[PDB]
Structure formats: C-alpha cells, structure tokens
Amino acid sequence: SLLPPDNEVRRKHETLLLDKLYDMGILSTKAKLSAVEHNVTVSAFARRRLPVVMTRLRMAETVQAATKLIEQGHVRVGVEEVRDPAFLVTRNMEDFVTWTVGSKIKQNIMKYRDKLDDF
C-alpha cells in the first residue's frame, strides 16, 4: 500500500501475493488487497487446517471426531498417510484428501452403501 499506486513492482507483487493466498485458500477472492488487510487471519489459517477442512468436506461429522480419526490414522492426503492434525490442506489438495487403504471407516461407508466388495 505504501508504494505509489502506478508502480510496476507494486502491481506485480499485488498479483503475486493475492494469487499465493488464493491458491492456499486463505482468501476467497484474488482481486482486492483489503482482503489481506482485514480477511487474512489466523482463523483463516486454522480453518485451512486438516480436521476442519475434512469437517467441511464431510469426511467426518465434527472437528473433534476428525481430529480423533486423523490421530488414529485413517486419513491420507494424496498418497501419504497423515498423522499430524495440523497439516495445512491447500486448495488443490482438498481434492486429494481421502481415506487410507485398509480403512475400517471406508469399510463402514461401503457397508452402509451396500457396496462392500471384499476383494
């Protein structure tokens, strides 16, 4: 902000900062620097954490149950199992968080949907 408004490096680093924060999912728009004024927030980081983002994705029911499930280790993010309940899930890894391989929670979901393939 304190740079002059027609500055090239100001414009380039505004677009870089907004694109970085929108790719990490903290901001919901990438067209205002007042988003980084009063919308970037430790609560925005803490809701980009893993048990809250799988509460939102409805992998669990509540953030307490989600922290219990990812402490017991049913949740992988991508291809690697995640035991840390503070792993910050970015906007393009929210498409890859899912259950682990031999999960009893996955067997519970398939047994509910009556698609329990035992092979």
Partner: protein, 297 residues
C-alpha cells in the same frame, strides 16, 4: 479429477458473486479517485465513509490497472486465452444421416484444429466425461431435421458456457461438385465480427472467437489468406467462410469456400452441456409481449 472440476466451478461461482458486491462498492470508489484528481466536490455519503477511505488507500492500484487495461477480467477464457490452441470436437446426434455426417465434416474443416467423432452409442455424460478427460476446449453438437441441420450446441469446457443456436439457410459444402469445389485450405483463419455491441454481444463474440487457434501477431495484418465472417442483423448471427487473394493493394478477390449459416442463438447457459439445470445467462424470450420488438446482442 471430477472433484477438481466441481470444486473449481464452485470457486468460480463464488468469485463471481464476490465480484458483484465488490463492483457495487468500486463504483463508489471510482468517484473518490476522480474527485481527488480533479478537485470537484463529491457526495457526503462517499466522503464520510471511513472504511471506504481506509480500504481505498490499499485498492487504488487495481482501479488504475483496469483503467489502463493492464489486467484482464475474471473469466473462463482469460485463463488460457492466447496460450493454448483450443481443441474442439464436432459430433452429431445419435443416429446421424449421410448429409448430417458430411455437414459435420464440413464444419470440422472450418476449424483448423478440430476433430470429428462418431457418436454411435455414446451416452452424453460419458461424452462430457471424455471431453474433460482429454482436456478438450470445445465440443459442438449437431442436430438435423431430415438431412438438413437445424441446431448447433457450442459448449466450452471444463465448466464454460453453452450456446445453443438454431440453424437456418444452410447451404452445404457437399452440394457443389468436386470439379468446382476442392480440398479446403487449413490455415489459421482471420475472423471478423460485425454488429455486436451489447455486453451480451461481447459474450457471444468471446465464446465464438475462442474456438479458433490464436494467430501469430508478427505480420498478421498482411499474411494469411482465409477469413471467417460472423455478422448479425436482428440478433441472428449469419456466418460465411471465405478464402481470398489480394490481387492489388487496393482490391481483393473473395471466394466462398465453406457453408453458409444464419444461426440464431436461443440459450446461453453458464454451465456445460451435461448440466440441464445450469443457470441460464440469456434465452430467447418468445411468448412475451415485446420480446419480438427488443433486439439483444
């Protein structure tokens, strides 16, 4: 992959709604910047908003960049505008006729980078699935009445708009003999658009000119020998496809090489071909009182 398409479409719709609210605020912020430079007194409801001034000090620069045109608007085409060659497949309805298949070939040859696909027994969600699975930019569906085509459906992918249009006055390439016609040249075509002035007209201009691969801008004003013309009167966009030689610096000889349409659009939906429940952006309002008087595009 499918979760990524759904997530990116939802993020796009949320960003568009936030842009609506931010435009409602930024119409007020552009009065504060113009009053600061010119010294004309402004409204008290604008000059006495502390949040507006406090955030204006950070958000000057994007308004200046939009005034200079240095940035581009959040759009489904602005992500890959002149970077990727848009690949596009043309398909028929389910059981095509021979003249519909030859017409599908003709409007495949209209685009230099298109491919044609045989429908046969191909369910339409799996058609959309295979398009997103092979990263196609556009699909175009064709519908015939009885050996004569009556509808196009131009759908942009991954989640872009459909333009459904009905065709009239179709004169096929496959009616004239091979002694008079020939193999159409496949060079990157120039495009001209005539008569689009509303923002809806610029919308249909965008979703029609992002079907063609981008022209090399070094010497494009004189090189290239093939032109495609979209000109609308009474919101029925009429399209010709010519090939030309510049027989002098003052004169040019045209030669009609492709099919002639006068397509009329009747539906522009912000959502792909599978979504029948997508939110429409415009539709041809028949059976209203002044829907025949009012001209869009």
């Amino acid at each position: 992959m499918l979760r990524k398409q759904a997530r990116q479409r939802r993020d796009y719709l949320y960003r568009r709604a936030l842009l609506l609210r931010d435009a409602e605020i930024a119409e007020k912020r552009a009065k504060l910047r113009a009053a600061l430079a010119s010294g004309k007194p402004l409204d008290p409801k604008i000059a006495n908003d502390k949040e507006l001034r406090k955030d204006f000090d950070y958000d000057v620069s994007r308004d200046i960049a939009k005034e200079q045109g240095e940035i581009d608007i959040d759009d489904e085409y602005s992500e890959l505008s002149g970077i990727v060659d848009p690949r596009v497949l043309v398909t028929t309805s389910r059981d095509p006729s021979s003249r519909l298949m030859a017409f599908s070939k003709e409007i495949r040859l209209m685009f230099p980078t298109a491919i044609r696909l045989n429908r046969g027994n191909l369910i339409l969600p799996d058609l959309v699935m295979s398009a997103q699975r092979e990263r196609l930019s556009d699909i175009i569906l064709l519908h015939e009445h009885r050996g004569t085509p009556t509808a196009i459906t131009i759908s942009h992918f991954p989640h872009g708009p459909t333009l459904m249009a009905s065709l009239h006055n179709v004169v096929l390439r496959a009616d004239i003999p091979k002694s008079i016609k020939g193999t159409v040249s496949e060079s990157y075509p120039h495009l001209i658009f005539e008569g689009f002035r509303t923002p809806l007209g610029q919308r249909v201009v965008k979703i029609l000119k992002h079907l063609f691969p981008p022209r090399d801008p070094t010497n494009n004003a004189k090189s290239g020998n093939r032109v495609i013309t979209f000109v609308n009167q009474d919101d029925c966009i009429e399209v010709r496809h010519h090939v030309y030689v510049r027989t002098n610096y003052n004169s040019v000889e045209l030669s009609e090489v492709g099919p002639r349409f006068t397509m009329r659009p009747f539906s522009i939906t912000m959502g792909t071909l599978e979504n029948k429940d997508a939110d429409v952006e415009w539709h041809l309002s028949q059976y209203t009182r002044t829907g025949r008087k009012k001209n869009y595009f």
